[PDB]
């Protein structure tokens, strides 16, 4: 994912899950501040996010909260952790139907990002 190729977060996450469903994996929890722009209307990503090869991520909780929700409504978690959990849901068999970013205000370390999941 090259830098600033998507003019907003809505079109950025539409291709992020497309690559993840295609077998590509990402992990940027250690350099999160260097790849995430500010404000969801900014071009995404700020810097190119490299592909990882060693993607092994086993969370300490149930990533799929419900059968149609990544997190409980109002749950706050690290922005990088959102993408690791979103990838986990896609790997385990859940498809993304919509990512909740319409009224959110923060993107850096903690953000209230949520997704609607679907079968297959």
């Amino acid at each position: 994912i090259k830098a600033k190729t998507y003019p907003d977060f809505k079109e950025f996450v539409k291709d992020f899950v497309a690559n993840v469903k295609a077998g590509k994996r990402y992990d940027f929890r250690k350099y999160q501040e260097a790849v995430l722009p500010l404000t969801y209307s900014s071009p995404w990503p700020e810097s190119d996010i490299p592909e990882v090869t060693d993607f092994n991520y086993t969370p300490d909780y149930t990533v799929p909260f419900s059968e149609e929700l990544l997190y409980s409504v109002g749950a706050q978690m690290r922005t990088a952790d959102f993408f690791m959990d979103l990838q986990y849901a896609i790997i385990n068999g859940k498809d993304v139907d919509t990512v909740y970013c319409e009224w959110l205000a923060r993107v850096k370390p903690f953000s209230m990002l949520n997704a609607k999941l679907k079968d297959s």
Binding site: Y61, G74, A75, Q76, M77
Partner: protein, 366 residues
């Protein structure tokens, strides 16, 4: 300061002595929750009266002339107390030919033996007072030998409430659990007055405190805040204040009107079993946080202390139908000059008049 070594004909050096003293915890005793109520009798009684019934007026017809009524209830209970008989004696065989530790050729004296023995008796007597106070705060006064003396939630026909925080799961709503804990102590006091509900004490251990401060919601609520309190709680010490007797500062956490205080007090009995103060009986599991919540002096007022301790006299001459005391110390001399005898008595029992206000909090889920 110089003595033998592995031969009696060569000399070595005696620098000094190093001593290790067991830890003693006194946070609950120093909290001053329980007020003294000295007694002149071996048992005392209480009256339990409950109107507890207001109901809604059902509408009726003006011409029929009909209506309602209401009954009343009164009960009575009783209370026993606990007794302790610490005894110990000294003899000349503990002074004859025994050298003082840390010295080369100086014999020990009787005064130091008596002083250390009495100090040990006193601290042994205070640690049990602290343990009994904690057990009363837990709602059940149980002796160190596991002998029940006051089941306060049966003497009082109430049920203990446990609040499951579920601190493992990020999706858990900590605000909801805190609000439930605060609301129960308002809706269940039934004192007829107005209850603040946020003056309660909360006493937790390592597991609960760490899991609480680890929560993503709690950390996020303070990370994006430019208050000095947020800076101190996210980056700073978090060991703000307090003293449990072993550590200079106990760690406290603020997430609103409530304060989470981590207390870790441990004691042992004659059988060697560790009696941790902040624990729930039955749940002998690690990786699960356990905490206790109880009202303070300012919640219900000082016109309604819930906690108090009753002291009663001892079975000795001149000590009948008299006000009780915390400690009775007696000294007797053995016949024919063979030593000195000591005794220590206490007729005490702590209790709580509204045990429903003593609730437990857990880090696991229901």
């Amino acid at each position: 300061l110089t003595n033998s070594e592995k031969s009696r004909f060569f000399l070595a050096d005696l620098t000094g002595e190093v001593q290790s003293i067991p830890n003693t915890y006194g946070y609950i005793s120093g909290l001053g929750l329980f007020r003294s109520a000295p007694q002149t009798q071996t048992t005392f009684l209480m009256d339990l009266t409950d109107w507890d019934i207001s109901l809604l007026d059902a509408v009726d017809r003006t011409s029929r002339k009909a209506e309602t009524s209401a009954p009343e209830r009164v009960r009575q209970i009783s209370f026993p107390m606990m007794y302790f008989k610490e005894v110990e004696s000294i003899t000349p065989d503990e002074i004859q030919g025994v050298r003082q530790p840390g010295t080369a050729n100086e014999l020990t004296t009787e005064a130091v033996v008596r002083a250390k023995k009495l100090m040990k008796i006193r601290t042994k007597f205070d640690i049990t007072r602290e343990f009994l106070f904690m057990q009363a705060l837990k709602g059940k006064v149980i002796d160190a030998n596991g002998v029940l003396y006051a089941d306060l939630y049966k003497q009082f026909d109430v049920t203990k409430k446990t609040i499951y925080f579920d601190l493992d799961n990020p999706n858990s709503d900590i605000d909801a659990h805190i609000e439930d804990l605060r609301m129960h102590m308002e809706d269940e006091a039934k004192t007829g007055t107005v209850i603040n509900g946020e003056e309660i004490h909360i006493v937790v251990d390592r597991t609960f405190f760490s899991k609480l401060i680890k929560h993503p919601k709690i950390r996020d609520a303070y990370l994006a805040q430019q208050t000095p309190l947020a800076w101190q709680q996210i980056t700073g010490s978090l060991r703000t204040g307090g003293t449990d007797g072993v550590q200079a500062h106990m760690n406290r956490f603020y997430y609103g009107g409530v304060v989470f205080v981590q207390y870790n007090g441990k004691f042992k009995d004659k059988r060697g079993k560790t009696h941790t103060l902040v624990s729930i009986d039955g749940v002998s599991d690690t990786n699960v946080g356990v905490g206790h919540a109880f009202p303070n002096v300012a919640m219900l007022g000082e016109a309604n202390n819930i906690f108090e301790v009753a002291y009663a006299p001892c079975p000795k001459m001149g000590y009948a139908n008299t006000l009780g005391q915390e400690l009775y110390v007696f000294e007797y001399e053995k016949d024919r000059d063979e030593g000195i005898d000591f005794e220590a008595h206490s007729y005490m029992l702590p209790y709580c008049t509204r045990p429903q206000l003593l609730v437990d909090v857990r880090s696991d889920a229901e």
